[PDB]
Ligand binder design. Structure first.
Ligand SMILES: C=C(/C=C\C[C@@H](O)[C@@H](O)[C@H](O)C/C=C/C=C\[C@@H](O)C[C@@H]1O[C@H](C[C@@H](O)[C@H](O)C[C@H]2O[C@H]([C@H](O)[C@H](O)CC[C@H](O)/C=C/[C@H](C)[C@@H](O)C[C@]3(O)O[C@H](C[C@@H](O)CCCCCCC[C@@]45C[C@@H](C)C[C@@](C)(O4)[C@@H](C[C@@H](C)CCCCC[C@@H](O)[C@H](O)[C@H](O)[C@@H](O)[C@H](O)[C@H]4O[C@H](C[C@H](O)[C@H](O)/C(C)=C/[C@H](O)C[C@@H](C)[C@H](O)C(=O)N/C=C/C(=O)NCCCO)[C@H](O)[C@@H](O)[C@@H]4O)O5)[C@H](O)[C@@H](O)[C@H]3O)C[C@@H](O)[C@@H]2O)[C@@H](O)[C@H](O)[C@H]1O)CC[C@H](O)[C@@H](O)[C@H](O)[C@H](C)C[C@H]1O[C@H](/C=C\[C@@H](O)[C@H](O)C[C@@H]2C[C@@H]3C[C@H](O2)[C@@H](CC[C@H]2O[C@H](CN)C[C@H]2O)O3)[C@@H](O)[C@H](O)[C@H]1O
Ligand SMILES: CCCCCCCC/C=C\CCCCCCCC(=O)OC[C@H](COP(=O)(O)OCC[N+](C)(C)C)OC(=O)CCCCCCC/C=C\CCCCCCCC
Ligand SMILES: CCCCCCCC/C=C\CCCCCCCC(=O)OC[C@H](COP(=O)(O)OCC[N+](C)(C)C)OC(=O)CCCCCCC/C=C\CCCCCCCC
Ligand SMILES: CCCCCCCC/C=C\CCCCCCCC(=O)OC[C@H](COP(=O)(O)OCC[N+](C)(C)C)OC(=O)CCCCCCC/C=C\CCCCCCCC
Ligand SMILES: CCCCCCCC/C=C\CCCCCCCC(=O)OC[C@H](COP(=O)(O)OCC[N+](C)(C)C)OC(=O)CCCCCCC/C=C\CCCCCCCC
Ligand SMILES: CCCCCCCC/C=C\CCCCCCCC(=O)OC[C@H](COP(=O)(O)OCC[N+](C)(C)C)OC(=O)CCCCCCC/C=C\CCCCCCCC
Ligand SMILES: CCCCCCCC/C=C\CCCCCCCC(=O)OC[C@H](COP(=O)(O)OCC[N+](C)(C)C)OC(=O)CCCCCCC/C=C\CCCCCCCC
Ligand SMILES: CC(C)CCC[C@@H](C)[C@H]1CC[C@H]2[C@@H]3CC=C4C[C@@H](O)CC[C@]4(C)[C@H]3CC[C@]12C
Ligand SMILES: CC(C)CCC[C@@H](C)[C@H]1CC[C@H]2[C@@H]3CC=C4C[C@@H](O)CC[C@]4(C)[C@H]3CC[C@]12C
Ligand SMILES: CC(C)CCC[C@@H](C)[C@H]1CC[C@H]2[C@@H]3CC=C4C[C@@H](O)CC[C@]4(C)[C@H]3CC[C@]12C
Ligand SMILES: Nc1ncnc2c1ncn2[C@@H]1O[C@H](COP(=O)(O)OP(=O)(O)O)[C@@H](O)[C@H]1O
Ligand SMILES: [Mg+2]
Ligand code: NA
Ligand code: NA
Ligand code: NA
Ligand code: NA
Length: 979
């Protein structure tokens, strides 16, 4: 409740010139940037407690405790003790600590990449300083400068409106509004939230433009004080995540069951009540998989960084998953399929077609520049146009300089300045009284100006728009200079002119004008843009103007890739069916051979109504028909046609098309740029907002932001989206297989009563060696040459962890790695004197420190450490047999449909993994001192080879398993083993 003078007098500011740059910076440095402050958080404290002290590591923390107590009771009691317990503790503790560090290096990394994408797409406001308009980062606005807003932009700070032009804002988020409340410079209510002279932070200007003085800036804002609570914030979990958990749950159920069973088995065989619970605890711990979620989050984060490099920024991680399943792409034409770099090619007037483009000069012998009709046409183009040359281009040529405005008005303005002269004087020659702006629902632009004829003081009215609309507003024709009527002979010549200019892939516009009678509208009468002050019809059409706009380079290949993937492409444009059909013919939306109902009518020379609608695979639906249609008809066109093009369509229509596409049961992505798109951009599954030309509304409302506005960028993004899935399945498949060889020894040991084949140190060696680096390498895998040549996926029918993964890992591949390790075990014992038949039952006697007389097969007598040494030589051999079989499992994991001979060994990280593991096994087995500390003994050379036959069998099996897939689709193998 103040005035414009009191406001400018309190903060200090010129209503017509704004602040000065020096003063602006003085205030910018005086009170801090216009950005909210970060909220409270848990530091590394709660970050490390969850890592080193979580749920699975806790058990290891116990193993370490127990062992230390085992050493203390020893050194305090027994003279000259042993040290296997002290080094066991020193080894276990080091494992919990490392696992924690690795996980930390991963949790942070993701938290940081997401923060980077927030500054990729910042917000830049429009401020007026020293009398000039400039777009600066929202973080540089201060209190006092002048700020201008336009329908589609976001209010930067708390403004005090000083001048508005039918400006409306969306005040729903702060409070609870719905409809657009209009912002007027006058004051209306005592409550600041109800008055219209104040713009607010985080609000958006729906329609109109306005000016205002920044009253409040930075945290000193309404939503800033409210943010006390906001600080917390909220996030989410992708589908995949709630898929993994589910799995984990089932497995836990299977694991708990088996535990109780192993319990009854132990007691029916005479174990100690305590030994049965020790077994239940161990078995349930060995059946539940560990790591699944960390690898899912890391894989997604890494893929997003891959996508932002290829021009596709994702507002969240759920978008990374939805992009792959994409079935339909509803794309627009001017901006996506094209470049918006249009240029006038053919002009129509005096029933004649005229060419142009006088090579940045006055040559080309286009048309007499003297033509009267041409003077009228050149004048309306130069007058109704709203664009203007960017300041300071007095040096560059007429075609290469910079302009501000629609691409249509820019092509028009340049043609008129090259072969027609300076527009600023042409614009002052005639004074602009009242102007009405363009719109997609109107489809025309009009304005009235004074007439510079010093002998005629009348009023001139000019309007341009889609040639069809303008034709319906004319009853005369400016012909050869005079006027004539629009009868059918020239009406048909005009129709054949639309197809001549249209088939050329050119954009066409209509231009007409009329002399308002100064007797019914005097020089003093003001024609406010409210009611019918101008005769819409009875105008004088002067002539058409056509311009070319080419498609992007990569676009033809993109549509081809979509067709091979099993993806439908739809073009939604505001132009004419001819230009639509054409662009479609070029990009590839409408491939060769397919015809429409009109094409068949033309070939057969039969009425269009007689032709069968099912006979045509492709169709071009207009807008009037779409408005008149119900729902079953829409489903008919969407289901029966393969290539559907939509021409002449308002924005309020897009939603009907999207609802039709979802009714079928398909995932859709839509490309949007304005305000009327926000509704559509929310209902669809993937909202693609333009980065270059979009508005704050389109970006806030969508899931993704296209950085280059290229249709080609998208298809590449979907390729990146499918690869995530493929690699995730491969990695999980590689991780779950080692579970079988680690559990089978503890089973035969208890049931069959033989010496323990795998122990605690060796098992930890397997998990950390063959499951960490090789697994990570898999993420980096390339794409098989089938990724785009395969149908999309139905999330309901196809899941990540299904009953087939467990079939290949546990059942087929696993059991083989187990047999491979059992051979190296049997071989080591038989050679050292203990044969296989004699081994069943020796455990009871084997594990007794007191029987130094153990007798072997050849009849020799063994002490306690002499036989324990051979057992340890078996733990080490098992280990190596596992790395050897892992070689094979890893190679076969690279591809699931193609061979490795086809895919190739170009992955460097995977190789690194093979050589490094081999090195770890050779190093630990041969180093001089592991004996004392880790309990691994040297392996003789004839032993390393025991696992080789089992490693070749796995590779050959998977190779054939695949050949049969490639040859017989939908067969038994694909139904059963394709995960
Ligand atoms: C950290 C862990 C925890 C521990 C770790 C541990 O290892 C180590 O840290 C150590 O702790 C280190 C700690 C050291 C601490 C300190 C030390 O430093 C210091 C030194 O320690 C030394 C000790 C140390 O030297 C020791 O030796 C260490 C070992 O300890 C364990 C030993 O074995 C054993 O404990 C020895 C100790 C002693 O023996 C204990 C005895 C009992 C306590 C108790 O009985 C004695 C006594 O009686 O207790 C009394 C107290 C009472 O209140 C208690 C109340 C009793 C309740 C009764 C109810 C029972 C119950 C319960 C019901 C639920 C069900 C039910 C059926 O039974 C039901 C039925 C009722 C109706 C029964 C009623 C019975 C009544 C009984 C009671 O009344 C009492 O007995 C009674 O009151 C008594 O007083 C009385 O005397 C009674 O006597 C008799 C009773 C009978 O005896 C008794 O009842 C009997 C027999 C029952 C029998 O079951 C009956 C059967 C026959 C049956 O009925 C039968 O007939 N069947 C006939 C069938 C038949 O015909 N069939 C014919 C078929 C025809 O068709 C009599 O009968 C009764 O009448 C009479 O009343 O109710 C009281 O105090 C006294 O009385 C006392 O004497 C073993 C270990 O713990 C340890 O090694 C000390 O000597 C020394 O002085 C000290 O200085 C977690 C574990 C790990 O997770 C796991 O890995 C684990 O490590 C492995 C499993 C190890 C195994 O493998 C190792 C090698 C490698 C492994 O590590 C590998 O890692 C394995 C892994 C595992 C998994 C899988 C896989 O493999 C791998 C995969 C993982 C991979 O996947 C991953 C992915 N996620 C990635 C990767 O990791 O992980 C091996 O080395 C291990 O050896 C091996 O085990
Ligand atoms: C829980 C999941 C486990 C997964 C794999 C577990 C691997 C376990 C494999 C073996 C462990 C059992 C212990 C074997 C010891 C049995 C000894 C035996 O058997 O002594 C019989 C013969 C020895 O004859 P000799 O020459 O000394 O007699 C000479 C006679 N004179 C001279 C008088 C003419 O030994 C033979 O013939 C060959 C016997 C050698 C081993 C055969 C064991 C059974 C056969 C295949 C097992 C693999 C099954 C795979 C299943 C996949 C799904 C689970
Ligand atoms: C010290 C340790 C050394 C370890 C040595 C390991 C050796 C390897 C072990 C076994 C190898 C045999 C496995 C054969 C399995 C069948 C593979 C198969 O059927 O692949 C089919 C592919 C055809 O694909 P496509 O036409 O659909 O591609 C289309 C591409 N697009 C789309 C671009 C046109 O064929 C191809 O890629 C052509 C590739 C041909 C490769 C032939 C290899 C066989 C030669 C000897 C094998 C060893 C025999 C016994 C050895 C005992 C050794 C001591
Ligand atoms: C004694 C018996 C033992 C039996 C044990 C069995 C062990 C496991 C059995 C087999 C596993 C090894 C199989 C190796 C496969 C070689 C396949 C190959 O050669 O396919 C030729 C490729 C294709 O080329 P392209 O241009 O047509 O592809 C065009 C690709 N598109 C279309 C996408 C552009 O060419 C390329 O990949 C480029 C050249 C890559 C050369 C890779 C050489 C390294 C191979 C293995 C490394 C050793 C690891 C073990 C470490 C332990 C050592 C101590
Ligand atoms: C990637 C992760 C996968 C695997 C991770 C495994 C984590 C394990 C972490 C730590 C384990 C530490 C083990 C400590 C090594 C032994 C220390 C020790 O407690 O030794 C005690 C022995 C004394 O035995 P004694 O007197 O009873 O023997 C009597 C012999 N009689 C009587 C027959 C003559 O000491 C001796 O023998 C003297 C020999 C000293 C041995 C020097 C070897 C250096 C050890 C590690 C350095 C290697 C790092 C790798 C760098 C790679 C660079 C590219
Ligand atoms: C481009 C870069 C490629 C890199 C590939 C991987 C690099 C491989 C690196 C090293 C491998 C060579 C190992 C040579 C070691 C010989 C040392 C030796 O003196 O050893 C003697 C033993 C005989 O022991 P004994 O029990 O009779 O006497 C024991 C007598 N006492 C115990 C009383 C002393 O003999 C043995 O260990 C035999 C040793 C094994 C023989 C090698 C056979 C493999 C040959 C080629 C396969 C290479 C894979 C490439 C595949 C490419 C496919 C596209
Ligand atoms: C140390 C040893 C190292 C080497 C070991 C090598 C072991 C690997 C050997 C073979 C791999 C076994 C893969 C198992 C898959 C067989 C499944 C099968 O039965 O699938 C038959 C399919 C039928 O599909 P469908 O759609 O008509 O079914 C319609 C079904 N309904 C009517 C119900 C809808 O395909 C057909 O019938 C026609 C296709 C038949 C393909 C036969 C492939 C034989 C290839 C190699 C075997 C020879 C190895 C020689 C080595 C000598 C070693 C001593
Ligand atoms: C699920 C996990 C964490 C439970 C671990 C239980 C541990 C603490 C239990 C399992 C078996 C127990 C041992 C069983 C037998 C004996 C022998 C006795 O003369 C001293 C205690 C001692 C050595 C016990 C100490 C505690 C012990 C090691
Ligand atoms: C350690 C040993 C004894 C365990 C042996 C486990 C074997 C028998 C288990 C491991 C994985 C299991 C398979 C997992 C999935 C399926 C698919 C289902 O539609 C039919 C059963 C089938 C094919 C299972 C059969 C039994 C199976 C092969
Ligand atoms: C392609 C297929 C059929 C070939 C199978 C070859 C079999 C028979 C070969 C492959 C590796 C071989 C083993 C390699 C190493 C040793 C250690 C030695 O001290 C005793 C023999 C023994 C245990 C061999 C026995 C025969 C063996 C198992
Ligand atoms: N400034 C303008 N004034 C009048 N008509 C225009 C203007 N710009 C474009 N047109 C024409 O009006 C119609 C509506 O265009 P629009 O809704 O933007 O569709 P598109 O997205 O295909 O350009 C098109 O035929 C277009 O050629
Ligand atoms: Mg558009
Ligand atoms: Na693990
Ligand atoms: Na959405
Ligand atoms: Na594996
Ligand atoms: Na594992």
């Amino acid at each position: 409740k103040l005035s414009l003078d009191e406001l400018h007098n309190k903060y200090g500011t010129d209503l017509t010139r704004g602040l000065t740059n020096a003063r602006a910076k003085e205030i910018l440095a005086r009170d801090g940037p216009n950005s909210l402050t970060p909220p409270p958080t848990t530091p590394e404290w709660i970050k490390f407690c969850r890592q080193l002290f979580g749920g699975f590591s806790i058990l290891l923390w116990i193993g370490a405790i127990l062992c230390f107590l085992a050493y203390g009771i020893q050194a305090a009691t027994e003279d000259e003790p042993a040290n296997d317990n002290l080094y066991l503790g020193v080894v276990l503790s080091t494992v919990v600590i490392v696992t924690g560090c690795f996980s930390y290096y991963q949790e942070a990394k993701s938290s940081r990449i997401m923060d980077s994408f927030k500054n990729m797409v910042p917000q830049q406001a429009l401020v007026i300083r020293d009398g000039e308009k400039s777009t600066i980062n929202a973080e540089f606005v201060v209190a006092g400068d002048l700020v201008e807003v336009k329908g589609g932009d976001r209010i930067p700070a708390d403004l005090r409106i000083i001048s508005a032009h039918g400006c409306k804002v969306d005040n729903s988020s702060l409070t609870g509004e719905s409809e657009p409340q209009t912002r007027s410079p006058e004051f209306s209510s005592e409550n600041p939230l109800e008055t219209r002279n104040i713009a607010f932070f985080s609000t958006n200007c729906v329609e109109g433009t306005a000016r205002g003085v920044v009253v409040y800036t930075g945290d000193r804002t309404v939503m800033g004080r409210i943010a006390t609570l906001a600080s917390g914030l909220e996030v989410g979990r992708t589908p995949i995540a709630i898929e993994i958990e589910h799995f984990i749950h089932i497995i836990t159920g299977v694991a708990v069951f088996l535990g109780v069973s192993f319990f009854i088995l132990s007691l029916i065989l005479g174990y100690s009540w305590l030994e049965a619970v020790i077994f239940l605890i161990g078995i349930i711990v060995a059946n539940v998989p560990e790591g699944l979620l960390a690898t899912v989050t890391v894989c997604l984060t890494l893929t997003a960084k891959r996508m932002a490099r290829k021009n596709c920024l994702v507002k969240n991680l759920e978008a990374v998953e939805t992009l792959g399943s994409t079935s339909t792409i509803c794309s627009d034409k001017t901006g996506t399929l094209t470049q918006n770099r249009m240029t006038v090619a053919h002009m129509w007037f005096d029933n004649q077609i005229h060419e142009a483009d006088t090579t940045e000069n006055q040559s080309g012998a286009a048309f007499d520049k003297t033509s009267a009709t041409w003077s009228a046409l050149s004048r309306i183009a130069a007058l109704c146009n709203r664009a203007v040359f960017q300041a300071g281009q007095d040096n560059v040529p007429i075609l290469k300089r910079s302009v501000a405005g629609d691409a249509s008005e820019s092509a028009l303005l340049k043609c008129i300045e090259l072969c027609c002269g300076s527009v600023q004087g042409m614009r002052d020659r005639n004074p602009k009284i009242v102007e009405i702006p363009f719109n997609s629902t109107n489809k025309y632009q009009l304005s009235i100006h004074e007439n510079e004829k010093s002998s005629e003081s009348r009023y001139l009215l000019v309007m341009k728009g889609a040639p069809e609309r303008i034709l319906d507003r004319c009853s005369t024709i400016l012909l050869n200079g005079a006027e004539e009527p629009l009868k059918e002979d020239m009406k048909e010549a005009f129709q054949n002119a639309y197809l001549e200019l249209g088939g050329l892939g050119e954009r066409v516009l209509g231009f007409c004008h009329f002399a308002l009678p100064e007797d019914k509208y005097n020089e003093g009468y003001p024609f406010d843009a409210d009611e019918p002050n101008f005769p819409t019809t009875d105008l004088c059409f002067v002539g058409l103007m056509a311009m070319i706009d080419p498609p992007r380079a990569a676009v033809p290949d993109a549509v081809g890739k979509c067709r091979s993937a099993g993806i439908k492409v739809i073009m939604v444009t505001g132009d004419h069916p001819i230009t639509a059909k054409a662009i479609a013919k070029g990009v590839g939306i409408i491939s060769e051979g397919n015809e429409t109902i009109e094409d068949i009518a033309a070939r057969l020379n039969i009425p269009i109504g007689q032709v069968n609608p099912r006979d045509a695979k492709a169709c071009v639906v207009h807008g009037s028909d779409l408005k008149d249609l119900s729902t079953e008809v829409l489903d008919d066109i969407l289901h029966y046609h393969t290539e559907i093009v939509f021409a002449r369509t308002s924005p309020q229509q897009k939603l009907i098309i999207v609802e039709g596409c979802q009714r079928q049961g398909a995932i859709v992505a839509v490309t949007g740029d304005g305000v009327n798109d926000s509704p559509a951009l929310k209902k669809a599954d993937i909202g693609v907002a333009m980065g270059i030309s979009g508005s704050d509304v389109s970006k806030q409302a969508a899931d993704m932001i296209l950085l280059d506005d290229n249709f080609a960028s998208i298809v590449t993004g979907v390729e990146e989206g499918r690869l995530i899935f493929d690699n995730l399945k491969k990695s999980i498949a590689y991780t779950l297989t080692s579970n079988i060889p680690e559990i089978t020894p503890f089973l035969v040991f208890i049931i069959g009563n033989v010496p323990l084949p795998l122990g605690t140190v060796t098992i930890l060696c397997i998990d950390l060696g063959t499951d960490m680096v090789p697994a990570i390498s898999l993420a980096y895998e390339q794409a098989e040459s089938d990724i785009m040549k395969r149908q999309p996926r139905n999330p309901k029918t196809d899941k990540l962890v299904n009953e087939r993964l467990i079939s290949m890992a546990y059942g087929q591949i696993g059991m083989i790695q187990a047999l491979g390790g059992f051979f190296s075990y049997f071989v080591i014992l038989a050679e050292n004197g203990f044969l296989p038949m004699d081994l069943i039952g020796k455990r009871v006697r084997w594990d007794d420190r007191w029987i130094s007389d153990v007798e072997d097969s050849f009849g020799q007598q063994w002490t306690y450490e002499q036989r324990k040494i051979v057992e340890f030589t078996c733990h080490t051999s098992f280990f190596i047999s596992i790395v050897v079989v892992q070689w094979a499992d890893l190679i076969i994991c690279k591809t699931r449909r193609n061979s490795i001979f086809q895919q190739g060994m170009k992955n460097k990280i995977l190789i690194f993994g093979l050589f490094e593991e081999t090195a770890l096994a050779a190093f630990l087995s041969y180093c001089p001192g592991t004996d004392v500390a880790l309990r691994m003994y040297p392996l003789k050379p004839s032993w390393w080879f025991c696992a080789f036959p089992y490693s070749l069998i796995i590779f050959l099996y998977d190779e054939m398993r695949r050949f049969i897939i490639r040859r017989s689709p939908g067969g038994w193998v694909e139904q059963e083993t394709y995960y």
